[PDB]
Write an enzyme that holds these catalytic residues in place. Structure first.
Site, PDB file in Angstrom:
ATOM      1  N   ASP A  74      -6.230   6.596  -4.816  1.00 57.83           N
ATOM      2  CA  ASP A  74      -5.381   5.238  -5.066  1.00 57.83           C
ATOM      3  C   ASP A  74      -5.651   5.041  -6.542  1.00 57.83           C
ATOM      4  O   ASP A  74      -6.323   5.817  -7.518  1.00 57.83           O
ATOM      5  CB  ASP A  74      -5.883   4.290  -4.119  1.00 57.83           C
ATOM      6  CG  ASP A  74      -7.451   3.769  -4.446  1.00 57.83           C
ATOM      7  OD1 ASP A  74      -7.994   4.382  -5.595  1.00 57.83           O
ATOM      8  OD2 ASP A  74      -7.796   3.114  -3.853  1.00 57.83           O
TER       9      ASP A  74
ATOM     10  N   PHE B 108      -8.131  -6.763   3.904  1.00 59.29           N
ATOM     11  CA  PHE B 108      -7.745  -5.360   4.177  1.00 59.29           C
ATOM     12  C   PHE B 108      -7.942  -4.631   2.649  1.00 59.29           C
ATOM     13  O   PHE B 108      -8.672  -3.270   3.024  1.00 59.29           O
ATOM     14  CB  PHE B 108      -6.360  -5.440   4.709  1.00 59.29           C
ATOM     15  CG  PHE B 108      -5.852  -4.021   4.996  1.00 59.29           C
ATOM     16  CD1 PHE B 108      -5.509  -3.094   3.886  1.00 59.29           C
ATOM     17  CD2 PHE B 108      -5.575  -3.604   6.009  1.00 59.29           C
ATOM     18  CE1 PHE B 108      -4.975  -1.709   4.050  1.00 59.29           C
ATOM     19  CE2 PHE B 108      -5.156  -2.212   6.407  1.00 59.29           C
ATOM     20  CZ  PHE B 108      -4.712  -1.583   5.375  1.00 59.29           C
TER      21      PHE B 108
ATOM     22  N   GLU C 175       0.761  -1.310  -0.117  1.00 54.74           N
ATOM     23  CA  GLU C 175      -0.151  -0.007   0.075  1.00 54.74           C
ATOM     24  C   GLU C 175       0.693   1.191   0.013  1.00 54.74           C
ATOM     25  O   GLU C 175       0.243   2.282  -0.353  1.00 54.74           O
ATOM     26  CB  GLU C 175      -0.769  -0.009   1.196  1.00 54.74           C
ATOM     27  CG  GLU C 175      -1.875  -1.116   1.405  1.00 54.74           C
ATOM     28  CD  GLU C 175      -3.069  -0.828   0.592  1.00 54.74           C
ATOM     29  OE1 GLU C 175      -3.187   0.093  -0.113  1.00 54.74           O
ATOM     30  OE2 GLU C 175      -4.024  -1.808   0.326  1.00 54.74           O
TER      31      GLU C 175
ATOM     32  N   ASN D 182      -7.356 -18.173 -10.471  1.00 51.97           N
ATOM     33  CA  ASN D 182      -8.531 -17.552 -10.360  1.00 51.97           C
ATOM     34  C   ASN D 182      -8.564 -16.210  -9.757  1.00 51.97           C
ATOM     35  O   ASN D 182      -9.420 -15.221 -10.203  1.00 51.97           O
ATOM     36  CB  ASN D 182      -9.481 -18.724  -9.822  1.00 51.97           C
ATOM     37  CG  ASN D 182      -9.944 -19.523 -10.688  1.00 51.97           C
ATOM     38  OD1 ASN D 182     -11.134 -19.228 -11.380  1.00 51.97           O
ATOM     39  ND2 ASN D 182      -9.255 -20.713 -10.774  1.00 51.97           N
TER      40      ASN D 182
ATOM     41  N   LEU E 212      -8.658   3.681   3.012  1.00 52.53           N
ATOM     42  CA  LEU E 212      -9.567   4.187   2.093  1.00 52.53           C
ATOM     43  C   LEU E 212     -10.419   5.222   2.916  1.00 52.53           C
ATOM     44  O   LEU E 212     -10.915   4.550   4.038  1.00 52.53           O
ATOM     45  CB  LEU E 212     -10.155   3.200   1.491  1.00 52.53           C
ATOM     46  CG  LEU E 212     -11.632   3.636   0.688  1.00 52.53           C
ATOM     47  CD1 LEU E 212     -11.108   4.042  -0.517  1.00 52.53           C
ATOM     48  CD2 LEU E 212     -12.637   2.314   0.410  1.00 52.53           C
TER      49      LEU E 212
END
Ligand SMILES: O=Cc1cc(O)ccc1Br
Length: 175
Positions: A31, A115, A22, A143, A43
């Site tokens: 972001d 998170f 991050e 996946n 966020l």
């Protein structure tokens, strides 16, 4: 591996992992998906209104920040967000059994994913969850690489997907 490399294991943990994915920013910024963010991936809001984001910031920190925080405040907010992600996995009847079946390093990748994405987003990945519980690591990773989470912002997700594949910290080496 040198005594060096065998020690890298003990240097890595969820806080250091999310800190690499991050980054650390002391001012509000947008972001990769354009959501106002601060600190270590916190966020603030999904609103396009900077004023909302400043408001969320002052609530989160508890002072008049005008868009800027200290490193210590960033770390405190980060620790809170980490604890929320862990608590969100452990109370969820779909995520907990899968998390319990994982080794320590893939448990960190699960906390990282929650998170980033939140509980309902992660718990919706039905196939990935079953593949992980069945130790089908290569398929689980392929996946995850189909998801919008990874594809809209690959650099923030790629090392988490590698970590689910391998159960090692190698993707965090040699930055
Ligand atoms: O808990 C979050 C999580 C997230 C994943 O991507 C896979 C498995 C789990 Br248990």
């Amino acid at each position: 591996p040198t005594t060096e490399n065998l020690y890298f294991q003990g240097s890595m943990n969820i806080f250091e992992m999310l800190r690499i994915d991050e980054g650390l920013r002391l001012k509000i910024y947008k972001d990769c998906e354009g959501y106002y963010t601060i600190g270590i991936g916190h966020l603030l809001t999904k609103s396009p209104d900077l004023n909302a984001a400043k408001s969320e910031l002052d609530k989160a920190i508890g002072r008049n920040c005008n868009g800027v925080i200290t490193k210590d405040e960033a770390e405190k907010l980060f620790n809170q967000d980490v604890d929320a992600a862990v608590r969100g996995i452990l109370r969820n009847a779909k995520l907990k059994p899968v998390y319990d079946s994982l080794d320590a390093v893939r448990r960190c990748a699960a906390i990282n994913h929650v998170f980033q994405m939140g509980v309902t987003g992660v718990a919706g990945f039905t196939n990935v969850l079953r593949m992980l519980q069945q130790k089908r690591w290569d398929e689980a990773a392929v996946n995850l690489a189909k998801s919008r989470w990874y594809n809209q912002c690959p650099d923030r997700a790629k090392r988490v997907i590698t970590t689910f594949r391998t159960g090692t910290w190698d993707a965090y080496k040699n930055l």
